[PDB]
DNA sequence: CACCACCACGCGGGCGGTAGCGTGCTTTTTTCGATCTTCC
DNA sequence: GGAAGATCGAAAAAAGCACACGCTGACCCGCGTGGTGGTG
RNA sequence: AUGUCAGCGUGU
C-alpha cells in the first residue's frame, strides 16, 4: 500500500523528493540530492551513534 | 550549462573568497581598474575594484551547486533576480573582459572614466541589467 | 518618546541593550541606504 | 514622556499586523490569497493593477517571465507594478460602493 | 617619510560555512490539494 | 460528461500554559577597514 | 538608579 501510495519510480527520483522535502526553493539537481543523502545517515562527520 | 551569476561578498573579503572559488575551478571575476588616488603621495596609481563587495561568478549549476556557492567562504550572498538567482549573458561579460581601458562599448567607457567607486559600480549594474533586459 | 524606551546608565561606561532603539537604528540605516540607492538612479535589480 | 517622532519612507512598506493576522485583512479586502500576497510583497512576483484592453485582467500576479513576455506582445498600456507600492496602487484604485 | 601601532567607525547583519540549525504539549483556525459527486 | 461546489483530511501556523516573594550568576555588538598619530 | 536570561527555593 505505501508502494502504491509512493509517486516516485526511480532512485534518482526519490532523491530529488528527498532533497525537495529537505531544501524547498532550491532547484534539486542528482550532485546536490547524492551528497545531500549521503551525508545524512552514511557520512562519519555528521551522523554519529555512539 | 555554463552560466553566469553574480556574488556579492562579505565586506573586506573579496580576495578571498575569490580564491576560494578559484579552487573550486568556479571562473570568479572582478573588474580592476588601475586609477589615480588622493594618497600621501599626490594622484599615485591604485588598482582597485570597480565596486567593492560584488563579484561575477562562471559555474555550471548541475556541476557545481547554488547551495555550495553560497557557504563558500568569504562570500555573503547571491543576487538574484526574482526568486531564481540572475543570470548574465556571455557576450557582456565578454566585452568587458576585452575592454580593459575602455553603444555598449561607449557604456563600458562612461563606467571606466567615473572616479566614484559607489558610481561606477551602479553604472555597471545599470549596463548589465540592461543586457539582460535586451537578451531577455 | 524617548522616556518610554530609555537608555539605562550601566555605571561602568556601557548602557543597557534598549531592544527598541536597536530596531530603530535598523530601520534607520535601511531608509538611509534606500534613499542613497534612489538617488543615484539605481537599477532595479539592487533597488528592489 | 509624550512627543512622538516620525521617519519619511522612501518606500511603501506593508503593515505586518494587517497582512498577517489572519484572516488577512489585506488578503480580505482584495480577495487574494495569503501566498500571493506575501510574494508580491516581498518583490518575487508582478502584479497588475490596470489591466486595459489586454486579455489579462486587473488582479492577476505574474512572474517575471510572465511579465516581460506581457511588457514584449501587449507591452503599450498595461501596468504591472511591484512591491508593495503596487499594493497600495490597487488599494487605491478599488471602489468600495460599487 | 614610510612604518608600525592605535582608535574611530560604519554600515551591517543569521552565522558561519566550502551546511545546516529543530527532535518529550494541547486546542483552534486556515488552507490547500485530492476526491467526489453531481449537476446543468 | 467535464467543470464547479462540497467534502475532507492532512499539513501548517498561531495562541496559551496561577499568584506572590527571596536569592545567586551573566550580560548588555562587531570587526575588519580606513583614517590618524607618534617615530627613528 | 534598568532590563533580560538561566538556575535554586518558599508558600499555596
Redesign the pocket.
Known amino acids: 500500500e505505501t508502494l502504491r501510495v509512493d509517486p516516485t519510480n526511480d532512485r534518482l527520483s526519490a532523491l530529488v523528493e528527498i532533497y525537495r522535502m529537505?531544501?524547498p526553493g532550491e532547484p534539486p539537481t542528482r550532485e546536490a540530492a547524492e551528497?545531500?543523502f549521503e551525508?545524512?545517515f552514511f557520512s562519519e562527520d555528521?551522523y554519529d551513534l555512539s | 550549462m555554463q552560466s553566469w551569476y553574480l556574488l556579492?561578498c562579505?565586506?573586506?573579503?573579496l580576495q578571498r573568497?575569490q580564491e576560494?572559488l578559484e579552487?573550486?575551478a568556479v571562473n570568479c571575476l572582478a573588474p580592476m581598474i588601475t586609477l589615480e588616488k588622493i594618497v600621501?603621495?599626490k594622484r599615485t596609481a591604485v588598482s582597485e575594484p570597480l565596486c567593492?563587495?560584488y563579484l561575477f561568478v562562471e559555474f555550471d549549476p548541475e556541476v557545481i551547486?547554488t547551495?555550495?556557492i553560497?557557504?563558500?567562504?568569504?562570500?555573503?550572498?547571491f543576487v538574484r533576480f526574482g526568486a531564481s538567482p540572475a543570470i548574465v549573458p556571455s557576450a557582456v561579460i565578454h566585452q568587458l573582459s576585452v575592454y580593459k581601458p575602455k553603444g555598449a562599448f561607449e557604456g563600458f567607457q562612461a563606467i571606466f572614466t567615473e572616479p566614484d567607486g559607489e558610481a561606477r559600480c551602479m553604472l555597471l549594474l545599470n549596463l548589465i541589467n540592461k543586457e539582460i533586459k535586451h537578451s531577455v | 518618546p524617548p522616556d518610554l524606551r530609555?537608555l539605562?546608565?550601566?555605571d561602568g561606561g556601557?548602557?543597557?541593550?534598549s531592544?527598541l532603539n536597536?530596531l530603530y537604528?535598523?530601520v534607520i540605516?535601511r531608509n538611509?541606504?534606500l534613499k542613497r540607492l534612489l538617488d543615484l538612479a539605481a537599477p532595479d535589480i539592487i533597488v528592489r | 514622556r509624550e512627543r512622538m517622532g516620525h521617519i519619511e519612507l522612501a518606500s511603501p512598506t506593508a503593515h505586518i499586523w494587517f497582512l498577517?493576522?489572519?484572516?488577512?485583512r489585506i488578503?480580505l479586502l482584495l480577495d487574494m490569497?495569503?501566498?500571493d500576497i506575501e510574494r508580491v510583497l516581498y518583490f518575487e512576483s508582478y502584479v497588475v493593477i490596470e489591466g486595459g484592453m489586454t486579455n489579462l485582467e486587473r488582479q492577476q500576479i505574474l512572474t517575471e517571465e510572465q511579465y516581460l513576455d506581457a511588457l514584449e506582445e501587449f507591452g503599450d498600456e498595461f501596468d504591472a507594478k511591484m512591491g508593495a507600492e503596487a499594493i497600495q496602487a490597487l488599494l487605491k484604485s478599488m471602489d468600495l460602493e460599487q
Do not use: C, E, I, W
Request: charge should be positive; hydrophobic fraction near 20%; charged fraction near 25%.
Open positions: 529537505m531544501r551528497s545531500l551525508n545524512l555528521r | 556579492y562579505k565586506r573586506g573579503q573568497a576560494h579552487r573550486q600621501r603621495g567593492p563587495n551547486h547551495t555550495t553560497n557557504a563558500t567562504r568569504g562570500v555573503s550572498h | 530609555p539605562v546608565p550601566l556601557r548602557f543597557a541593550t531592544d536597536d537604528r535598523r540605516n538611509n541606504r | 498577517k493576522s489572519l484572516p488577512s488578503g490569497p495569503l501566498r
